[PDB]
Amino acid sequence: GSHMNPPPPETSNPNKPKRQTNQLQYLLRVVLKTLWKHQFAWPFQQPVDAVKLNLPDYYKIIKTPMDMGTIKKRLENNYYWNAQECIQDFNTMFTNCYIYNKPGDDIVLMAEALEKLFLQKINELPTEE
Ligand SMILES: OCc1cc(Br)ccn1
């Protein structure tokens, strides 16, 4: 896309260790699946396109961008070593939204609905086997 948007987060790197765990499988098959199909998921399914949205300060503020499209790719391509890495990516995505936007902005209410679902699912993250 535009040279004025940063490259997306890494989703492929042969030097990084990687493993399948039952917790990472749950994050794909239960958590990502549930959030992806939510009515309010669409703004979070790809990196923020700050050019198209006319937000030229976005990547001045948000220096740790993350989105569910990136997480989806990371889970499908087995990028992660453990569930904590993936959970941190979801938390980063939510907190970016809350940092950049005004409380009560539509995008914040949408993020909050996804986060409430997220928390319910993560409270049932299975014991690592
Ligand atoms: O206003 C910032 C923003 C825009 C979109 Br689309 C998704 C997440 N955050």
**CA dist., res. 78 & res. 25, Å (int):** 10
| CA dist., res. 71 & res. 82, Å (int) | 13
Joined tokens for residue 123: 């409270």
Residues in the chain: 129
Contacts of 7 (CB under 8 A, 6+ apart): none
Using CA atoms, how far apart are residues 125 and 120, in angstroms rounded to an integer?
9
Could you tell me the two tokens for 29? Answer: 């098959």
Resolution (A): 1.1
**C-alpha span between 124 and 2 (Å, rounded):** 40
Q: Whose CA is nearest to atom 7 of ligand 1?
A: 43
Give residues (CB < 6 A) around ligand 1.
43-44, 48, 53, 97, 100-101, 107
Distance CA 43, CA 67 (A): 9
Only one residue has tokens 């950049």, namely: 100
28 Cβ contact partners less than 8 Å away, ≥ 6 residues apart: 75, 76
What letter represents residue 102's amino acid? K
Q: Which of 61, 107, 114 to mutate to test the pocket of ligand 1 (most atoms within 8 A of CB)?
A: 107
- Give CA torsion, residues 98, 102, 107, 110, to 10 deg: 70
Q: For the chain, give every domain's residue range.
A: 22-124
Contact 18, 125 (CB under 8 A): no
CA distance 80 to 102: 32
Q: How far does the chain reach from its first CA to its final CA, in angstroms?
A: 41
81: Cβ–Cβ under 8 A, 6 or more apart, which residues?
A: 16, 17, 18, 19
Helix spans in 1-129 (H):
22-26, 33-36, 58-61, 68-76, 83-100, 106-122
Q: Domain spanning 22-124: which superfamily?
A: Bromodomain-like (1.20.920.10)
- Assign 81 to helix, strand or coil: coil
What is the chain's Cα-based Rg?
15
Structure tokens given for 106: 């539509």
> Given CA atoms 34, 6, 65, 53 in this order, what sign does their dihedral have?
negative
